[PDB]
């Protein structure tokens, strides 16, 4: 069975950029929601309950007709907001080999950042925006709800190793930004994790 | 060129259950961004600029391959928000003939809320729940972002003439409501213009 992770810091830990209100509402109702939908699911079928959530949404056209949205979707939520979590802090910088290789693939980090808030703000509904490693090159894109680039094109229409990506749902920034979502995306600069972001680069995996 | 329509009432006629903030916002920002984009893509269509919105989406096939998802998306955004402005209103009662047709299609009144709900908090992610006329029986369908069953089953996933609907958007209930989408659910039958949505029925197109 999946259980909400613990949080890494505190709830106001990312202020004055992410709301205390907002992390708390998001953590605590709206991951521990799709934690507790997937477990549903899963009671039925042993055989897929207990693989760790990244690994069950690259099998999702080996679920049951019936069981595959419900999981996409659910799964696609846990697995996406438990990257989230561990993805953001404050005081970190951008540097070594990941520096590197955004400065190669984008030119710039400018130019890196620019793309980013482009996808991010480009998504219309609910999505996420990411920035993924596809064989050895670094791209940026977004997926539609709470798909993942890990479940596959024909999914999600997107592939790739997730090194890092921006929730653009409107409950990640309504309370505080209310539409202005090009103002939320301009703050996570300052609480994107770029030490867990350099970590997953240097994994691959 | 469309116009951003005007409230029927003040932003804060529909408290206790719909709040003030919410309605400046979502009327003020969130359509006014609809019609802004909708008219920038018209702009260089003529043709098509001069039917009501509610027209246009019925031929989006015909649009070119270029300009389809934008007013897909913003034509829908505009046809769907002018429709809920409208089809809210205080102090209105469920009676004639809509009445009667509600209880034939679905057995009763409390059936119908029953079915409204479900489609309505079952949608993922951003959409709208409609009640509908198909024909001449009444029915109640949902869609994702910015469609509208008036575009048809092959673009939209559904069909049918509205009757009146509900946006699920985060941004129509995140200020008061957050997480709880069910309660902003229950508010809305405290707020539907029946009066409206007989007049649509009577008209039938
Ligand atoms: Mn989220
Ligand atoms: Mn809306």
């Known amino acids: 069975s999946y259980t909400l992770p613990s949080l890494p810091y505190a709830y106001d830990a990312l202020e004055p ?4 209100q907002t992390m708390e509402i998001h953590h605590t109702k709206h991951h521990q929601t799709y934690v507790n939908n997937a477990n549903a699911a899963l009671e039925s079928l042993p055989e897929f309950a207990n693989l760790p959530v990244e690994e069950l949404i690259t099998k999702l056209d080996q679920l049951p007709a ?38 190669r693939d984008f030119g710039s980090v400018d ?9 991010a703000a480009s998504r219309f509904g609910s999505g996420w925006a990411w920035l993924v490693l596809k064989g050895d090159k670094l791209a940026v894109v977004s997926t539609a709800n709470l798909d993942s680039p890990l479940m596959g094109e024909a999914i999600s229409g997107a592939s790739g190793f997730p090194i890092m990506g921006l929730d653009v749902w409107e ?35």
């Open 111 to 119: 130019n890196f950042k620019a793309e980013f808030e482009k996808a």
């Open 17 to 20: 950029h992410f709301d205390k």
């Open 66 to 103: 019936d069981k595959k949205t419900v999981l996409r979707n659910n799964a696609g939520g846990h697995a996406n907001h438990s990257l989230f979590w561990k993805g953001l802090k404050k005081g970190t910088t951008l540097q070594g080999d990941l520096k590197a290789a955004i400065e």
């Open 171 to 205: 409950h990640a920034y309504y309370l505080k930004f209310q539409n202005r979502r090009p103002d939320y995306i301009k703050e996570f600069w300052n609480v994107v994790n770029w030490d867990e972001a350099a970590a997953r680069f240097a994994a691959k995996k």
